[PDB]
């Protein structure tokens, strides 16, 4: 079977600049009968199915912007996106259909660069409904920041927490090229009610010093 | 051209699943091929097979041959992929995809090529765990979630199994500023995620905000109102 290998696995490119993704096949995917490379490119956004961009290595599908171009022959192929736009954030895949089984490359994620954006930081105490059930989830939201690196630390009565929080980050947003992050601290009801001050401390390139959001259990 | 698949399911190891894909505007069932491709969570793609509906002939990847059947019903423009003796490793989003055919002058046959339309996908989870509905808890807007003229509020979507959930706000009327985070599988064997939205803080006393969650694997839908904190 033909192994499809993409390079790089991820890249970050500035808007209006060129993005180049490579795909190499373990053997030739040139079909002699019509002298076409049976090589296709797809774009996939999160939660969405793949969308066809290019087939026969270099023919654009109708509706696809002309900033997308494919080139290569035989075993070495390239997808070039010129004048990159925000809506081009996605994972790109190559696929061959010369040989059965049809096979795909492993994807290349494309992200975009932008200026630093500090997070807006928000905190949510657990609901009384959840506490009644025996557990407290405390949520610290870091909204719309860039770059993706951030430090997030929980303090409970000023004690740094370890091993009891969970961080989830969104994929980069097309509308403003930012990320958002949720940090959820999980405590039993009994531990939640032993302490009063709940704080999440966020450090980020866009913050001139770390930001703390906190609340006092029980207070307005 | 539209390809609509059946919903997400949990299946026990050793069982079989049948996924459907209905095409609507047929040109598709008369002149095209329909393939099935799967994508394990967090990974790439594996072709399982395809069929050319007007001929009834179907090819399959070696690794599925014997265990997979692809059929197509021209009177309902619906194609199906049945996969049997399910194993953990069969957990994936299964896609149907349409594409044109070319003729191979050496084989003397029509063959599959590129896919031009994909369906939305069907997440099939193979697990001995039972499905479980989510519980929705509010992330109430308050002084600690407001800045300038903006407030954040949200929905904690807790303790469900397996993936996926769909989360909407106000029956899909509210889409701007929404972030639904990727679920994390908890030590308990259950998933949780939050969904949040930023809105004008001036709206909080007058606009209702409801979190709508659909969990197809447990056949549950939940709606929860999220109201501002009141002291």
Swiss-Prot record, chain B:
Region called Disordered, residue ranges: 137-149
Residues annotated as domain Ig-like: 137-227
Stretch list, region CH1: 137-226
Impact when changing residue 225 to R: In IMGT allele IGHG1*03
Disulphide bridges: 155-211
Parts forming coiled coils: none
Cleavable signal peptide: none
Top-level taxonomic group: Eukaryota
Disease: Multiple myeloma: A malignant tumor of plasma cells usually arising in the bone marrow and characterized by diffuse involvement of the skeletal system, hyperglobulinemia, Bence-Jones proteinuria and anemia. Complications of multiple myeloma are bone pain, hypercalcemia, renal failure and spinal cord compression. The aberrant antibodies that are produced lead to impaired humoral immunity and patients have a high prevalence of infection. Amyloidosis may develop in some patients.
Quaternary organization: Immunoglobulins are composed of two identical heavy chains and two identical light chains; disulfide-linked. Interacts with FCGR1A; this interaction mediates IgG effector functions on monocytes. Interacts with FCGR2A and FCGR3A.
Function per UniProt: Constant region of immunoglobulin heavy chains. Immunoglobulins, also known as antibodies, are membrane-bound or secreted glycoproteins produced by B lymphocytes. In the recognition phase of humoral immunity, the membrane-bound immunoglobulins serve as receptors which, upon binding of a specific antigen, trigger the clonal expansion and differentiation of B lymphocytes into immunoglobulins-secreting plasma cells. Secreted immunoglobulins mediate the effector phase of humoral immunity, which results in the elimination of bound antigens.
Protein name: Immunoglobulin heavy constant gamma 1
Organism whose genome encodes this protein: Homo sapiens (Human)
């Amino acid at each position: 079977d033909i192994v499809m290998t993409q390079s790089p696995d991820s890249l970050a490119v500035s808007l209006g600049e060129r993005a180049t993704i490579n795909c190499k096949s373990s053997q030739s995917v040139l079909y002699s009968s019509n002298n076409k490379n049976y090589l296709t490119w797809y774009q996939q956004k999160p939660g969405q199915p793949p969308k066809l961009l290019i087939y026969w290595a270099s023919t654009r599908e109708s509706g696809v912007p002309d900033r997308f171009s494919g080139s290569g022959s035989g075993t070495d192929f390239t997808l070039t996106i010129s004048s990159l736009q925000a809506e081009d954030v996605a994972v790109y895949y190559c696929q061959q259909y010369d040989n059965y089984p049809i096979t795909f490359g492993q994807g290349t994620r494309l992200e975009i660069k932008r200026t630093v954006a500090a997070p807006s930081v928000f905190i949510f105490p657990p609901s009384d409904e959840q506490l009644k059930s025996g557990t407290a989830s405390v949520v610290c939201l870091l909204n719309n920041f860039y770059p993706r690196e951030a430090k997030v630390q929980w303090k409970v009565d000023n004690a740094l927490q370890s091993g009891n929080s969970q961080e989830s980050v969104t994929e980069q947003d097309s509308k403003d090229s930012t990320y958002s992050l949720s940090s959820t601290l999980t405590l039993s009801k009994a531990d939640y009610e032993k302490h009063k001050v709940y704080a999440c401390e966020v450090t980020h390139q866009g913050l001139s010093s770390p930001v703390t959001k906190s609340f006092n259990r029980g207070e307005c | 051209v539209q390809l609509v698949q059946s919903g997400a399911e949990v299946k026990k190891p050793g069982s079989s699943v049948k996924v459907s894909c209905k095409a609507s505007g047929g040109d598709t069932f008369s002149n095209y091929a329909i393939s099935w491709v799967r994508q394990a969570p967090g990974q790439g793609f594996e072709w399982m097979g395809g069929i050319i509906p007007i001929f009834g002939t179907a090819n399959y990847a070696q690794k599925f041959q014997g265990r997979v059947t692809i059929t197509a019903d021209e009177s309902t423009s619906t194609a199906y992929m049945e996969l049997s003796s399910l194993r953990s490793e069969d957990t994936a989003v299964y896609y149907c995809a349409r594409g044109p055919e070319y003729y191979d002058y050496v084989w003397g046959s029509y063959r599959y090529n590129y896919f031009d339309y994909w369906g939305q996908g069907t997440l099939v989870t193979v697990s001995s765990g039972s499905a479980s509905a989510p519980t929705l808890f509010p992330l109430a807007p308050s002084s600690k979630s407001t800045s300038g003229g903006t407030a954040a509020l949200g929905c904690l979507v807790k303790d469900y199994f397996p993936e996926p959930v769909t989360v909407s706000w106000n029956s899909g009327a509210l889409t701007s500023g929404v972030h639904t985070f990727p679920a994390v599988l908890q030590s308990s064997g259950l998933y949780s995620l939050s969904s949040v939205v930023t809105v004008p803080s001036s709206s909080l006393g007058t606009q209702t905000y409801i979190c709508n969650v659909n969990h197809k694997p447990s056949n549950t839908k939940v709606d929860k109102k999220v109201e501002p904190k009141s002291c």
